[PDB]
Design a protein around this ligand. Sequence first.
Ligand code: GFK
Ligand code: GFK
Lengths: 187, 187
Amino acid sequence: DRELAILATAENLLEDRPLADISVDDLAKGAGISRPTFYFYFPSKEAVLLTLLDRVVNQADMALQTLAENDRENMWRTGINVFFETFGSHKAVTRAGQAARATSVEVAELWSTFMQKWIAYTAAVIDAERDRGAAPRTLPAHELATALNLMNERTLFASFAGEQPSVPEARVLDTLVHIWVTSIYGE
Amino acid sequence: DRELAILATAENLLEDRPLADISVDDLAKGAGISRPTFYFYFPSKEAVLLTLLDRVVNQADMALQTLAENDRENMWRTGINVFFETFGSHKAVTRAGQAARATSVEVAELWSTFMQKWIAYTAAVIDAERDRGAAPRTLPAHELATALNLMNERTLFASFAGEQPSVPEARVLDTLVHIWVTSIYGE
Ligand SMILES: COc1ccc2nc(-c3noc(C4CCN(C(=O)CCC(F)(F)F)CC4)n3)sc2c1
Ligand SMILES: COc1ccc2nc(-c3noc(C4CCN(C(=O)CCC(F)(F)F)CC4)n3)sc2c1
């Protein structure tokens, strides 16, 4: 498709510079189409990013659903690793998509929809752990799930962007898993 | 000062709308000065926000220094509460300042400088807890401190903005304290 060519070009260019510094002409050129032909597939470069982010969050979400059809530390590590690997494989899209949350209501709403879904799935697993006697009844599961998921969002994305400060990318999985296991199973 | 009047006006208007929708004329008007007189004190509305954020982060930082000159759960709760109360007392400045991290290198660098300072202070306290035998030698203190501080940044600011998703503001302190105590003292 010309559609897939535009998406691949946008992902490539986002590795070099932000969306602000990519023109519809750059996207058309890389995709081997004219400018007006671009506007047939997407109303704006912003819509291209929204589509790229939607594919990445759906890939993470489908990978977590795959896990869910089947030791406590290794379970949480495997689950966190879906997001580490999936977002970690699409750092430029992840970075540009997180920035676009501030300027695009559609990007804000996509990110918010999936965060609510992943928080609800986390809380359901914590509740099942509590029901089976593996985890103590401490905080409300949904509030614990919210903070742990927000920690992961901020910590993954700071590490991938090499922000100062950040956990080094080679330490971020062990770091998050420790905090998830001690806070879910502790006291 | 006319300076203090501009800062107070900016903090007031940021409660109603974002910086983008506040003009130098609104700031001058509220401060009882002309437009050119405004430019005597500040080069831009962006500089006004940078100054407001600098005062708020310094107030938090001075309050934490005050604590530091003197049960483990209550210690961490008191320390987290400096940020909850200080930022919670300046929600409009906090919100606009966090958004400005994306568009102002000076705002990005202020926030990054103080986060490094608070992470280093957290890690020093964790290390002292380990040295005294109160906390086990688990993760590297500085990496644990980084993730817990990033959790607090994201969780406090989502709660204050009423984002979906967020921990309710009346639950956020208990939530963060649980995760800090179990991850610092656990295993
Ligand atoms: C085969 O058996 C298994 C194996 C693994 C496994 N993991 C499970 C799980 N439940 O909830 C979560 C979170 C989703 C959000 N999550 C995130 O980190 C979200 C990151 C973000 F997108 F938020 F930034 C972290 C894991 N994982 S159930 C399960 C069953
Ligand atoms: C009288 O005895 C006491 C009493 C309290 C007490 N608290 C201490 C402490 N050490 O590190 C921190 C963190 C700073 C960053 N922090 C944040 O939440 C930062 C929030 C952010 F700005 F990051 F968003 C959370 C507490 N607190 S030592 C101490 C000694």
